[PDB]
Design a protein around this ligand. Structure first.
Ligand code: ZN
Ligand code: ZN
Ligand code: ZN
Ligand code: ZN
Lengths: 201, 7, 201, 7, 201, 201, 7, 7
């Protein structure tokens, strides 16, 4: 993808945001991979929207890209697991443990074992190393702090965290410039559409 | 504990 | 939203498609509501992706907008219900029946009753009016045919089914025209970016 | 049968 | 089975009751079929122990033996179904409806349909013919009243509802009589066990 | 309970068996606790009827009575757990692990941990110490062998494993002796029932 | 209504 | 391994 094409995506990102096409904005961020919206990410983490959190992340990194991303996905999936235990849904917890958390066992067996063991506790805060889990809201917040640090230090995100400074409606301004250019070609000069060049017979 | 840490 | 702004969305739709940002394309279609992608819709229906099918439709119509849309959502949810029965998941079927299909009971009590009754059959094809359900693939296909007819006749879609004919990369062409316009202002004329106007000192 | 039909 | 053998069962029933071998008492009642313990039945119905209620009944009658027994099983299974709906377990309700209640559909289609329809109500008391369901405790009690009437009128139970009047410990008395008879045979007369006849050398 | 009363139970056990009141036999064994039917136990274990296996055992011993009984219940519950894993029902497995197997964790933490860990394996035979699990049938058989040894060595069963040698129908013989004794009292001697003493006016 | 009744 | 053994 060109540097032109990349800048065009940013212009479109601005336009979509100004038009309040919110889901479209974040899909473009994700699919282009050009910009990671930390504000959006914090919002989805605070809301515990783990499926979207991972889907969004997938546009930027895979679990085994490097140690930062591994810990990012591990922390997220661990929190998802802990929340399942907290609502006393052990069936879902085991599902999470096997589907989502097992990939980390290779990289740390004893950690995966200790997390597995939480399944059999009446309240998983009985484990002194898991006794620091407060409630869901605080747990998400303290983890989000770590997630932000990890993402900001993750080399895969290094030029993707700050939106370019642009004047508002930059794409619309360029479009208007296009229409000026088209009209400037006419003689004798007296707009139907953006779809075809304008003309004055 | 699956843990890289950072500064 | 302006006619300008609407045309810009179509230009962006073309760009995203050319860049193969597929999810972003369909999110923009959905959120703008300017273009219903029938090809995309057929694809999601054939694949039985009912959650996305309804999410996508939601950008264009609600279940009670008119009688066409009511039948569209009814046919979709009925098929979702029938497929649940077909895989012998009666718990999911009842869930669908209560969550998704109940809204139609007001508009047709006896129909909702007859559909409810299918719950208790060993194979719901024992009902002679439901004996026309072949297999899942054929059932989706015959229904899709009806869905297309309903959508095409649905007044809410009347100028949203045909993509405007444009030259390829129309947005990129306009952008290039913008850069020509900016350079044309320079004197004495000798591009850094799209983000700020170009200049020649 | 929930059914509007069409032509 | 002899009239002797039948009377022996009653003697054993008395013994087991006096020894407070409670489960054994009711198993013998059930397997012999000689005595239906209404008090026990009321207790299991009040407690909503439907599995044991049907298991116990099975020693005395099958669902299609006659119209009384059909209504007995129907009323029980209907109450089991209604209670499932009441705790908002529609998955279990449908299970009950298909496994337990379907056998009655042949004998009454429209009744089975109307009961099926309760599945889709937010609270099944919205059906005016099911609006008489109070709470679980009262519903069990009013139904138990009907169950008692049905059982008492059911020809299959006609000599099984009243326990024979016996002196307490009749079996033990007969046993003691046996030991007296054995000793009376000895000469010159001077007990090891019940297992072999007593002797005095 | 008297030695008389105990012998009467054995006589009744014989009678019920001869009358083929099978469930009643085993309920009496269980509730009296006088005789543990190993043949019956083997049958229920081979059939994997774990609920009845434990219910039956409960008449003779509790899990923490001694080390033999602890291992008996542990082996049974472990097999129940392994079978759940084997049918890929991890939700049921965790349930078993928490409800039934947790009591053993105190007496052996590391064993309970290692068993817990099997939850996360795709096939639990990947653990080399659990690789000896063949199929369900063989696993039940090899375990049953151990169960028999444990029960036979368990001091709580020491006089409960061998049925007293009796002539067939000993209770009926004693009853007949009773009727002879009653008739022998009559003068001038010329049976209505077992319920009241016989008389000849 | 599945209903035999009685007296 | 929860294990008393025996002879
Ligand atoms: Zn012009
Ligand atoms: Zn220039
Ligand atoms: Zn004697
Ligand atoms: Zn006599």
């Amino acid at each position: 993808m060109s540097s032109l094409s990349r800048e065009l995506v940013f212009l479109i990102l601005q336009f979509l945001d100004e038009e309040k096409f919110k889901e479209t904005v974040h899909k473009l961020e994700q699919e282009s991979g050009f910009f990671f919206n930390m504000k959006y990410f914090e919002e989805k983490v605070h809301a515990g929207e783990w499926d979207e959190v991972e889907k969004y992340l997938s546009g930027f990194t895979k679990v085994d890209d490097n140690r930062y991303s591994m810990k990012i996905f591990f922390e997220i999936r661990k929190q998802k697991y802990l929340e399942a235990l907290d609502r006393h849904d052990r069936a879902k917890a085991v599902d999470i443990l096997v589907k989502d958390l097992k990939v980390f066992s290779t990289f740390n067996e004893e950690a995966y074992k200790e997390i597995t063991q939480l399944l059999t506790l009446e309240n998983f805060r009985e484990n002194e190393q898991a006794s620091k889990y407060g409630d869901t809201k605080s747990a998400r917040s303290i983890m989000l702090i770590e997630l932000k640090k990890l993402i900001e230090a993750n080399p895969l995100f290094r030029e993707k965290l700050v939106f370019p400074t642009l004047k508002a409606s930059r794409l619309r301004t360029l479009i208007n410039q296009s229409l000026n250019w088209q009209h400037q070609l006419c003689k004798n000069p007296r707009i139907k559409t953006l779809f075809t060049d304008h003309t004055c017979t | 504990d699956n843990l890289i840490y950072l500064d």
